Amino acid sequence: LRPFICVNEKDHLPSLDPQADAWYREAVALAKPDTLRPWDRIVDLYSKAVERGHWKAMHNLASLYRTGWKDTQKALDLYQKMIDLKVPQGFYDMAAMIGNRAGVKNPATDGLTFLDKAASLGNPPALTELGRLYIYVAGQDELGLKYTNCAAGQGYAPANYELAMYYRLVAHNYPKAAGYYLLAASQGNDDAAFFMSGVFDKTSPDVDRMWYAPDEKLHKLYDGIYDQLAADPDLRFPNLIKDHPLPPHPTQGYDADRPD
């Protein structure tokens, strides 16, 4: 991807067939892991949707084949169908399965690795993974941050978790980092909610708190958020940030670059 150009994945997706999407949505509802799942019906619905070109159904069904409830080749075939439709997620899935470097051998990538192709089409998982490699392995912080923010901007929670970790561990901008942890947690990110559950705990060491002062109310709040989310990954917390603004940081205020 040179030069790096950030695009929105939505501008590179096939339209979804209405009947197909009805079938997909019904299968998704039936397949919720915290319910007693009717596997035959779920596979049937996904399969009907796949026959009418639904790429999200291809993705979910391929996952089911990868784990069983196992058919490696059926999963691979589905990923290839997605790639055939130039679905960005398809390139990501193929990378995540057989490896990134094999992408150069696939004609649909045009001599790009699978992740590079996916990221070129705006895929937030690929953007997040490559951004991570640029920051921590290549030492190209600014470029990796551009990748990561391109994914975060599309509402991708794990990318907000990566930004939080960067600003906490590398930049040491704790209010910024906390803003990103809270954003990821609100969007359902388990890692982020877990970290936030320790930040205002008086029994946490200073570094776990990012040197915030302990706060009983906020500890109970974020401990509760994490409790809920840990049991049910589908929860979101759309009001969390605005209903409970962050206290000022004892030395960094509301931005380490502008302590005042």
Q: Which residues bind Au ion (CB under 5 A)?
A: 12, 219-220, 243-244
Q: Which is nearer to Au ion, 12 or 52 (CB)?
A: 12
Q: Which is nearer to Au ion, 41 or 172 (CB)?
A: 172
Least Cβ distance, residue 242 to Au ion (angstroms)? 9
Cβ atoms of 176 and 212 closer than 8 Å? no
Q: Which is nearer to Au ion, 74 or 244 (CB)?
A: 244
Q: Which is nearer to Au ion, 219 or 249 (CB)?
A: 219
Least Cβ distance, residue 68 to Au ion (angstroms)? 15
Cβ atoms of 57 and 23 closer than 8 Å? yes
Q: Which is nearer to Au ion, 117 or 219 (CB)?
A: 219
CA dist 88 and 161 (Å) reads 22
Least Cβ distance, residue 51 to Au ion (angstroms)? 20
Please count the other Cβ atoms lying within 10 Å of the Cβ belonging to residue 173. 19
Least Cβ distance, residue 237 to Au ion (angstroms)? 8
Which residues are CB-neighbours of 246 under 8 A, at least 6 positions away?
175, 178, 179, 182, 254
SS3 assignment for 133-196: HHHHCCCCHHHHHHHHHHHHCCCCHHHHHHHHHHHHHCCCCHHHHHHHHHHHHHCCCHHHHHHH
Least Cβ distance, residue 185 to Au ion (angstroms)? 12
Q: Which is nearer to Au ion, 81 or 244 (CB)?
A: 244
- DSSP state, residue 99: -
Give the closest residue to 152 by CA, choosing from 144, 142, 160.
160
Least Cβ distance, residue 12 to Au ion (angstroms)? 3
